[PDB]
Amino acid sequence: DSVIKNIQQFKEKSWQDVSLAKMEEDAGKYGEQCSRLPKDLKEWQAYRDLKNYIDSLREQLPLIIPRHWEKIKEITNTKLNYENPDQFYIEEIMGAKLDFREDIEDITESADKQLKIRTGLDEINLYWNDMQFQFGIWGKRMLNGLIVGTILERLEEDQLQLSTFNSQRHVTPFKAEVENLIRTFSDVNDTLDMWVKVQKLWTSLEPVFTGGDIARQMPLQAKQFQGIDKNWMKIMEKAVETKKVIPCCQNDMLKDFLPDLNRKLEDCQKMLEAYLEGKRKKFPRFYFVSNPTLLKILSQGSEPTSIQEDFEKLFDAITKV
Hints:
- The PDB classes it as motor protein.
- This is part of a larger assembly, with one chain.
- With about 325 residues, the chain is an all-alpha fold.
- About 75% of the residues lie in helices and about 0% in strands.
- The protein has a two-stranded antiparallel sheet with strand order 1-2.
- A hairpin with a 5-residue loop joins strand 1 and strand 2 (about 145).
- The protein is elongated.
């Protein structure tokens, strides 16, 4: 009856289905010590068999107690049993706590590791598609990328992981995907690297050309910025239609345009800078003042009152006019 009660307790634990650790070992053990002396006199073998089963369960419960779990399940003659079994595994885990199975897992363990590497590679695949360029407000007078560095850190970490995977022998079945991913990351780095720079150039030059006074002069220079910005207005316009991260790296017009726009932006930027130097020569005091202030003052030349704040920088002891 005691053996039957122990069996009932085991059944109850199975019904409970929940991570055995101390109770399973204990219930069997307390009963067993009293039982061994008793059993020889008692005989009735069935009881002995029940006791043996309880002892086996106690031995297994300790053994029973993510990727590592999956690997453990694989080297246990069960599949995702820990995953599914862990969630609601009635008795497979208890049952599996052989040498042949271990050997098979080892034969297969290497495949799982390659397989494990493949799983990691697949995990990368999911994040890149889920990730979409982080666009941020520029006033829409569009939206630019608020952060490109975080994505760049991911690009190198992924490339380093792919290079580490390439060093491993087991990567050879999924090596072609890794090589294509490395090529994709390399092209994304060429695009993103160019993209952050172009926005900065554009961010630096957006105010000067749109603003009227500098733009009143330099008619030729003004047209390029006018025309140059239209493509950028369109590129940003295109961004709203498709915002996924993989697509931004691979979109056709955007990939070709960033290099061309950047050269266009740099030429205008160099020309703008040369113009600033010419103005600086005219009024020698301008050299002491910083470029942002100089740009602000030249642009605000038309309204003399606007320039009053910067009077102190231009001449000594003339705070307000």
